[PDB]
Amino acid sequence: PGENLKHIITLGQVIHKRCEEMKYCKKQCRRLGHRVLGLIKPLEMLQDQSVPSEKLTTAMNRFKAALEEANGEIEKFSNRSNICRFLTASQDKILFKDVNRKLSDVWKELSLLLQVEQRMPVSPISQSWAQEDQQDADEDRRAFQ
Ligand SMILES: [Cl-]
């Protein structure tokens, strides 16, 4: 469990650094990196300190898989010609729509389990993504011309 947590933290840190380097569709890439860094922040605080339930282990594995899926999409979209093909085949122009929904859904479940089982604090503000994604997609579309 300690190794799984460390892996998730490292993977989130790598995704944020990669997002900051992406040359095209920067609003969407930077939003993904910002969101991922925000999710790993309480995990990093937890790491600096219980036996997980069945529900916690599966939530942790789903979160790890969603981050791996995001890392795979960042790799694909680092090449400009892959962005162009995706955008032309897309109606809403949102690069990370599926990855973003998986991350938000799993985080809702995972954060609650960490608060109940592992004494993770309840944050003054929880972690509107779909609406932000359309705005970012529109701004990136204009810059991609
Ligand atoms: Cl661009």
Residue numbers in the entry: 0 to 48, 52 to 129, 132 to 149
From the paper:
MLKL is a key player in the necroptosis pathway, encompassing a C-terminal regulatory and an N-terminal executioner domain. It gets activated through phosphorylation of Thr357 and Ser358 in its pseudokinase domain by RIP3 kinase and subsequently oligomerizes via its executioner domain and inserts into the membrane. To this end, displacement of the auto-inhibitory brace helix (α-helix 6) from the four-helix bundle is required, which depends on a specific composition of phospholipids in the membrane. Currently, two classes of compounds are reported to inhibit MLKL by covalently binding to Cys86 in the short α-helix 4 located on top of the four-helix bundle, which comprises α-helices 1, 2, 3, and 5.
